[PDB]
Amino acid sequence: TRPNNNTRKSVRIGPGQTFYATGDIIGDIKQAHCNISEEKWNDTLQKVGIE
Amino acid sequence: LPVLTQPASVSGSPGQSITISCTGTIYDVGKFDLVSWYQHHPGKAPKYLIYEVKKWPSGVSHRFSGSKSGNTASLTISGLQVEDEADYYCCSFGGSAAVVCGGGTKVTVLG
Amino acid sequence: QVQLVQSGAEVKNPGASVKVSCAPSGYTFTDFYIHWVRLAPGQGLEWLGWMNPKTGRTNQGQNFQGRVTMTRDTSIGTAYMELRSLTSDDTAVYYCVTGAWISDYYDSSYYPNFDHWGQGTLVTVSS
Numbered sequence A: 001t002r003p004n005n006n007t008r009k010s011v012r013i014g015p016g017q018t019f020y021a022t023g024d025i026i027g028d029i030k031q032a033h034c035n036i037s038e039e040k041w042n043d044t045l046q047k048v049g050i051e
Numbered sequence B: 001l002p003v004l005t006q007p008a009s010v011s012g013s014p015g016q017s018i019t020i021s022c023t024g025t026i027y028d029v030g031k032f033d034l035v036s037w038y039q040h041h042p043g044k045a046p047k048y049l050i051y052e053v054k055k056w057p058s059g060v061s062h063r064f065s066g067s068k069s070g071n072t073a074s075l076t077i078s079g080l081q082v083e084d085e086a087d088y089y090c091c092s093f094g095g096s097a098a099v100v101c102g103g104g105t106k107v108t109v110l111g
Numbered sequence C: 001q002v003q004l005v006q007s008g009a010e011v012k013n014p015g016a017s018v019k020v021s022c023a024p025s026g027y028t029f030t031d032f033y034i035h036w037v038r039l040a041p042g043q044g045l046e047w048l049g050w051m052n053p054k055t056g057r058t059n060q061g062q063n064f065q066g067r068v069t070m071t072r073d074t075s076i077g078t079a080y081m082e083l084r085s086l087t088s089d090d091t092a093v094y095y096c097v098t099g100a101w102i103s104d105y106y107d108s109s110y111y112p113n114f115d116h117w118g119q120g121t122l123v124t125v126s127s
């Protein structure tokens, strides 16, 4: 996940075309991450070690 | 801000059952279960007795219980006494990035 | 029991500024958020803002920005709340409030899990 809850601010660049840049962030600025249960990962590591 | 529509007083004799509700908008509670309820008692510091809509922190009689449906939640009660009279409030998630509170209410239990 | 104290009752003139305090202990000050509310005199209370004790991030009520500002120091480890444009009608008991635990991987600043409350800072103003 990315815990920030960002938002879309609009711009126009040159004629009749657009690009989008993040707006003012809502709430606390936390860190982004992934999570893996260390038990299933570890059982996988030892199952690959035995092979 | 939306001052949630608390009924200013619902009460009766001791031993009655009542439901303090407070209703808001489609955006506030429709995506979270972040609701908590508090007490005020001739001017002393508040008390904190229900949170996460229906969860009990600790030293709370289970007469008090929570309920929810869409734009409104409630503080269910049964079996009152005179000491239960207090200024009850509801404060819940109110959008980016804060909480908003209701209009308050007094349980005018008679005696 | 967790230790928690505010600045005592205060007096100002209307339109002046306030610097209400909160100096808790019993937990390390960068564990839980800090919240502030305005308990109206005979009406429903109103919510002012919250402190991240560990960073400079702040947020306040959607009606109170500009009127309220609120900072913190770490040399002494105490946070101060401010509010301009006082009036006689808004004289109220201002309460220091403890928020939820601080997690770095998800946001819990707005969770109203207020387990601890201050003793209440009354403010009253006159000409």
Ligand SMILES: *[C@@H]1O[C@H](CO)[C@@H](O[C@@H]2O[C@H](CO)[C@@H](O[C@@H]3O[C@H](CO[C@H]4O[C@H](CO[C@H]5O[C@H](CO)[C@@H](O)[C@H](O)[C@@H]5O[C@H]5O[C@H](CO)[C@@H](O)[C@H](O)[C@@H]5O)[C@@H](O)[C@H](O)[C@@H]4O)[C@@H](O)[C@H](O[C@H]4O[C@H](CO)[C@@H](O)[C@H](O)[C@@H]4O[C@H]4O[C@H](CO)[C@@H](O)[C@H](O)[C@@H]4O[C@H]4O[C@H](CO)[C@@H](O)[C@H](O)[C@@H]4O)[C@@H]3O)[C@H](O)[C@H]2NC(C)=O)[C@H](O)[C@H]1NC(C)=O
Pocket (backbone or CB within 6 Å): A001, A034, A035, B051, B052, B055, B056, B057, B058, B059, C026, C027, C028, C031, C099, C100, C101, C102, C103, C104, C105, C106, C113, C114, C115
């Ligand atoms: C990816 O992976 C990561 C992990 O790798 C994962 O992150 C984790 O997610 C978990 C789930 O969200 C999250 O768990 C929460 O943990 C909270 C607290 O964590 C522990 O701390 C306390 C320790 O207490 C403090 O304070 C006391 C004083 O009170 C002090 O004496 C202690 O020493 C200790 O001191 C502090 O400072 C120390 C200095 O060294 C420091 O070392 C300590 O660590 C500490 O910082 C323990 O007691 C707990 O058991 C925890 O183990 C925990 O509070 C929280 O539960 C609450 O919140 C839930 C929602 O998240 C609620 O649903 C639930 O009901 C709980 O509500 C309690 O708290 C609220 C206030 O917040 C209160 O209002 C409630 O009433 C209730 O309180 C109850 O207890 C009090 C007494 O304490 C009573 O008075 C009340 O009446 C109630 O009975 C969660 O359990 C975990 O922290 C997090 N890990 C990290 C590192 O961030 C991530 O989510 C993953 N994400 C993805 C996408 O994969």
Ligand SMILES: *[C@@H]1O[C@H](CO)[C@@H](O[C@@H]2O[C@H](CO)[C@@H](O[C@@H]3O[C@H](CO[C@H]4O[C@H](CO)[C@@H](O)[C@H](O)[C@@H]4O)[C@@H](O)[C@H](O[C@H]4O[C@H](CO)[C@@H](O)[C@H](O)[C@@H]4O)[C@@H]3O)[C@H](O)[C@H]2NC(C)=O)[C@H](O)[C@H]1NC(C)=O
Pocket (backbone or CB within 6 Å): A005, A006, A007, A026, A027, B001, B002, B025, B026, B027, B028, B094, B095, B096, B097
């Ligand atoms: C994560 O971040 C997102 C934004 O990036 C947040 O989502 C917004 O949250 C705010 C609340 O802070 C929402 O605010 C509401 O916006 C409504 C928009 O109104 C227009 O659009 C609707 C629907 O199309 C039309 O019907 C309407 O007529 C308008 O054209 C307002 O109408 C709302 O105002 C009313 O309700 C509030 C209380 O809810 C009252 O106080 C007002 O006086 C008024 O009566 C309201 O302001 C906003 O809609 C959200 N936007 C999106 C895209 O989701 C998340 O909240 C945030 N999440 C977290 C956890 O931080």
Ligand SMILES: *[C@@H]1O[C@H](CO)[C@@H](O[C@@H]2O[C@H](CO)[C@@H](O[C@@H]3O[C@H](CO)[C@@H](O)[C@H](O)[C@@H]3O)[C@H](O)[C@H]2NC(C)=O)[C@H](O)[C@H]1NC(C)=O
Pocket (backbone or CB within 6 Å): A023, A024, A025
């Ligand atoms: C990133 O930096 C830019 C500045 O380069 C910030 O934009 C500026 O934000 C200020 C404050 O909101 C704007 O000024 C304000 O205007 C209002 C008008 O209502 C006035 O009342 C305020 O007193 C203040 O002067 C300013 O206009 C704006 N800059 C531009 C070019 O529009 C921006 O806020 C920064 N990003 C973040 C997330 O803060």
